[PDB]
Amino acid sequence: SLAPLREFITGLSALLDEQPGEARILREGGALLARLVARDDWLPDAFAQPHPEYYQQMLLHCDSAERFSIVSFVWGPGQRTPIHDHTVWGLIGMLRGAEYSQPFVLDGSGRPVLHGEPTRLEPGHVEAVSPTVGDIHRVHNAYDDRVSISIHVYGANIGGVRRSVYTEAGERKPFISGYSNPYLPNPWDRSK
Ligand SMILES: [Fe+3]
Incomplete structure (x- = not known):
């Protein structure tokens, strides 16, 4: 039930583990967040x-x-x-x-x-x-x-x-x- 929030946290953590540039953070982080807020x-x-x-x-x-x-x-x-x-x-x-x-x-x-x-x-x-x-x-x-x-x-x-x-x-x-x-x-x- 809170699982989408957990999945967002660990997904974003994995992304930032790669030491991405900001542009990639905003784009690929943006997709992660859109997935989280797609379903209420x-x-x-x-x-x-x-x-x-x-x-x-x-x-x-x-x-x-x-x-x-x-x-x-x-x-x-x-x-x-x-x-x-x-x-x-x-x-x-x-x-x-x-x-x-x-x-x-x-x-x-x-x-x-x-x-x-x-x-x-x-x-x-x-x-x-x-x-x-x-x-x-x-x-x-x-x-x-x-x-x-x-x-x-x-x-x-x-x-x-x-x-x-x-x-x-x-x-x-x-x-x-x-x-x-x-x-x-x-x-x-x-x-x-
Ligand atoms: Fe603001």
């Missing part, structure tokens, strides 16, 4: 509950060597992120509902400016971020009336990464996201 039959309800004020970032798994971490992002109705970056590679897989992602780039003085049209991420689909491919964005729930969920995989313990968020007026601030959950799931019991 594994995420326990406890990791899908929204918070009335804040979007939830629930850690599902962190790699011992901190090569990656997996998070359930639970969007309450109409919720959105600030503009922010990541500083490491990231893959976002849509599980439930949908989200819009808007790219930003920094201008001459380091302020974020709109870059292009936003994209809509649908269930089963995956999108990448990184310093290389485009790292700064704002994401929001495509729905103002229901919960959406995406599964995020980052090339570090994301809850510990020192990165940047932008204020509403467009100033840069240091940012460490942390996690909402004291408890992680247990996908490791192979006794049954």
Whole structure:
């Protein structure tokens, strides 16, 4: 039941064991994640509950060597992120509902400016971020009336990464996201 999550963890671990370049991580990791979010039959309800004020970032798994971490992002109705970056590679897989992602780039003085049209991420689909491919964005729930969920995989313990968020007026601030959950799931019991 949690087996798809275990299979993703061990599949991604095997991929990263090969010391791949980022481009291959995003592509072949992207396919691994799309397989995980293709069927919505594994995420326990406890990791899908929204918070009335804040979007939830629930850690599902962190790699011992901190090569990656997996998070359930639970969007309450109409919720959105600030503009922010990541500083490491990231893959976002849509599980439930949908989200819009808007790219930003920094201008001459380091302020974020709109870059292009936003994209809509649908269930089963995956999108990448990184310093290389485009790292700064704002994401929001495509729905103002229901919960959406995406599964995020980052090339570090994301809850510990020192990165940047932008204020509403467009100033840069240091940012460490942390996690909402004291408890992680247990996908490791192979006794049954
Ligand atoms: Fe992000």
